[PDB]
Symmetry: D2
Subunit: 335 residues, 4 copies
């Protein structure tokens, strides 16, 4: 069994915990501790009830210094400095680092002082991390000696599984992405100070362009495409679920039928359970609580010369939460 602790019990941390229990604990992982500065009773209530993901089907109680989930006792801690946390005493294998304040190997190193063996950052990492992984695409690069890695971003986890089979079988010369994306808690209800002058504007009333590193990051996970992809995001008024719209130049002449056929074979083979393929006339809400990293909408595929457009749906919370569990097992199983 792999012993995990969660640092930061915000949305990402809660959704990782719910994905573990709702899926019947199918990974050989036990969550043994959570560190968060909030009231444990408040954090238990937000585990039981959610707007986007509905009611948790199991049981949650607070009992002394523990939160008890489906009978499992999870130790609740509250310290700002990971060097002071009892990770060694609790025999923690992997800390899932979910606060956003420890995104370099230098900073995530504090968990190592606390006594944990390894760390997975739930976000893009600095240049000093040991690896950046999209599960299903490059988790094979991991080594038993890696100690701090990044699980990339929600958007990179949708785009990379799309790009890999297309580059392998057809060839991608250049590509430009737009992600039409749900709002997040980094945004605002009504206009107020923000570091990003566009995100300072009401998220509920507008389409809001914003930067994304996801297209450039595909170069970290597929080095053969470094520098060949770029793009941006448009934040729109929905609570959850997003879509990648990828336009690319193919290395040879092709058709809608060939492009869709490549993606379909990949969803049934090397990328089964990560990349899905759909032909039904669905809308974004139908993908809420869908655990896939990427689902191709086959009806939207277009080809004009060597210019191709493909589109893929993703639950930007739930896909990524499930992959954090997969990457945990891969990291601890690496030779």
């Amino acid at each position: 069994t792999i012993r995990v602790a969660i640092n930061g019990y915000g949305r990402i941390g809660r959704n990782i915990l719910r994905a573990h229990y709702e899926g019947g604990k199918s990974h050989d992982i036990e969550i043994v501790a959570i560190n968060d500065l909030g009231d444990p009773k408040t954090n238990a209530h937000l585990t039981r009830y959610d707007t986007a993901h509905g009611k948790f089907p199991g049981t949650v109680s607070v009992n002394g210094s523990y939160m008890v989930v489906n009978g499992d006792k999870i130790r609740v801690d509250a310290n700002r400095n990971p060097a002071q946390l009892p990770w060694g005493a609790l025999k923690v294998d992997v800390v899932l680092e979910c606060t956003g304040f420890f995104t370099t190997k230098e900073k995530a190193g504090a968990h190592i002082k606390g006594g944990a063996k390894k760390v997975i950052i739930s976000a893009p990492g600095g240049a000093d991390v040991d690896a950046t992984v999209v599960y299903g695409v490059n988790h094979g690069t991991l080594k038993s000696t890696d100690t701090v890695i990044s699980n990339a971003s929600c958007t990179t986890n949708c785009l990379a599984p799309l790009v890999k089979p297309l580059n392998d079988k057809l060839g991608l010369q250049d590509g430009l992405m737009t992600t039409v994306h749900a709002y997040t808690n980094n945004q605002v209800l009504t206009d107020v100070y923000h570091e990003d002058l566009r995100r300072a504007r009401s998220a509920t009333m507008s389409m809001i362009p914003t930067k994304t590193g996801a297209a450039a990051a595909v170069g970290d996970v597929l080095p053969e495409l470094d520098g060949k992809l770029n793009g941006y995001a448009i934040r729109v008024p929905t609570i959850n679920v997003s879509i990648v719209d990828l336009s690319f130049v193919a290395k040879r002449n092709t058709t809608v039928e060939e492009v869709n056929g490549i993606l379909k074979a990949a969803s049934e083979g090397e990328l089964k359970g990560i990349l899905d393929y759909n032909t039904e006339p669905l809308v974004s809400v139908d993908y809420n609580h869908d655990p896939a990293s990427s689902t191709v909408d086959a009806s939207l595929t277009k080809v004009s010369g060597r210019l191709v457009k493909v589109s893929s749906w993703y639950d930007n919370e739930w896909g990524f939460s499930n992959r954090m569990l997969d990457t945990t097992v891969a990291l601890m199983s690496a030779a």
Copy 2:
């Protein structure tokens, strides 16, 4: 002075009337009559007050068989058959056909039997129309012999002013558009029967892919690009304002600086007052009630090899409304 009547006083007709009066009657036009089947007191109320476009800054009174706007008496009629309308007796030069029921020349010709000289359809027309016009791009195609024309669509009026200068000064091999678009009254509040199984789903809770012919229609306006463009729409939860996202393959090597430079020059020259150019960090609500057909957002332009992305904002109601007035003048001035 050109005497104008409006057939159909829904959102399109009311917005044309409001654009005429709010802009200070800048066009040498008088609106002399409106035909509509609804209660004139309800239609006056919806002229005074709107959610998207706010309160009309002038005055509106009902007085017998007239609606009086800023002192001008406008005759109100109610007849389903255009051949029976008194266009001849009221000396109507141009009918703006806004009902959606008369979109071919064979059907719209009924207005001419009623006594009008010319008809402009506020939508894409049938294969039998005399012309399809995007004002600023191809209004010079118009002839004094033309009697029934189309003003194209809101999306075609955003896209064609972008592609004209880019094709002229650089060259377009192939292109694919996504328009991220505000919902309209063809959609639904909560799921219910619809001819389109995606538009049958709540407009307020999802991103909803749907077809549009606007990219292909650029071929009617710019014959040199016929067959080289295609695209689709994604409907999202906003009440008004949309964005065109165009990905295209250039005919030679280029840069972000050159692409933006071509667009800025066109905005200051031949397309002044139709294509605008913006470098500020704005969001969709800032373009509400902006009368431009197309505003390039210069900060969003990307280039990867010969693959280029350009993005342009449009008020999908107000830009089109103002162009209907411009096209009226062009039709009556044509040699």
Copy 3:
């Protein structure tokens, strides 16, 4: 077993069918036929997928002249005239009349000429109906001779279970209700002609006062309160779930503790399964897909002298849907 047909397969009809199957067919009822003018493949699609109520957990197939739900074959018809429908040949006991076009006994009686035994209208009925029922409150008024009845409205089914115990155990002199209510498809996305000048305005951007007869209608269900209640609705930007806010004058001195105690006792006794009682800090989305007619929010109760405020949550679609099944059984069991 009671054989049931549904006339009108809009949101009301689909939600009745879904309540029957999702609850495990708890009522001794079989749905044998549906009459509707729309394409059966579209109606099957909208059964499988909904925005407000999510994905149907079972299976739906179209197969000739049948829609097959969890293996049960349901005959699909399409005829505007109920007298021409084969209710006699299919041995239909009760027709649930859900089109909105047959709300008097004189009109709904056409189903009986078609061969059905009984009709229940899914809305307030005309002055000629045999009864108006809020299940749990007055279903004991029903007689074996009754043939066409009304199930009242969604709002009346929330209000009447509150006022019955309060009048019985304390006494109500006078009362005034505001229901703060989710939008419906009678409203609009952006302003356009409507018979009601307030509902002509965008539902997504405003609070919109509108009339309702639901408070006065309590007099049909509880004759002792006839003339003592009135009220109105405020429509707000949510897709589903509403709240009744009732202010009333008690017939004697009282306290918050006594008022809440009366309601809690009723929820555990005579109104069990119809009126619920909640003390948790929840919000409207938590009551989506809750089948209760009325849930008292105990934390909100206020008393100032003899003036009392009580507030109650209701899923305006799902509570009513489940009550239609309860009322079907009561009608066929009446002595």
Copy 4:
């Protein structure tokens, strides 16, 4: 001239500045300084453009240590501790305290150490404040010796002008209020930690009950009604504009016509420019940017016995912003 400084240039502070300039500087006030910790260029941009209130009609520049509005140079400061601000050197008469961190006379006293003469808190104050004022209702209580006062809340400023003429002419025994209220930046986009377990829930998807002190606070401004009013708020998915729904027991028998007549005479007399009276079929958006404290919607008035319901619209940002200017003049003019 009264010399004013603004402490906190959030929404309340910006809207006070805009109300001064947009109204043509009709009060004899000059804004001489702003203290805020943000980038002055960002704060200037948010003065030029707003989602709810649209574009500022004037000019705004940043020039060294000043923000220049319509030609007026306003000194920009940035210090957390008001004791260290140069209010004395700048000869400040009144600080408009808009941060939410100085809501007691004890804390607001730091501005007095800085050298300012007086302070008005833009919010409910602690028990130690010299006065709590609703302009038009009780500004007559102010004395030349008062140094720290409260302008009450947005909701108290709507409710008090409603209650005063009704209590004066008819008599109010007891009253209970519900305010159906726009969301604010204290709330969240998607569920996240909050001190209030209901405000921790997405503001865009739900009706959210929450506490309000506004009804009890009417007792501070009209001591004859202390203890006779109570109520709560329901936050709903709109960006701005709210409504007070007041239910009360009148001291004698009355009618709809009498109640409306009392309110109409008050809007034309003692409360002119503070309480307005409307008979048109309007919705919340039509009241955006309306400077009144309270506008009675006469069509909504109901009477059942001695039980009365009256409803009043308020722009919860703009009404209050304009009253802050009125209260400033009253405070400095007091004998």
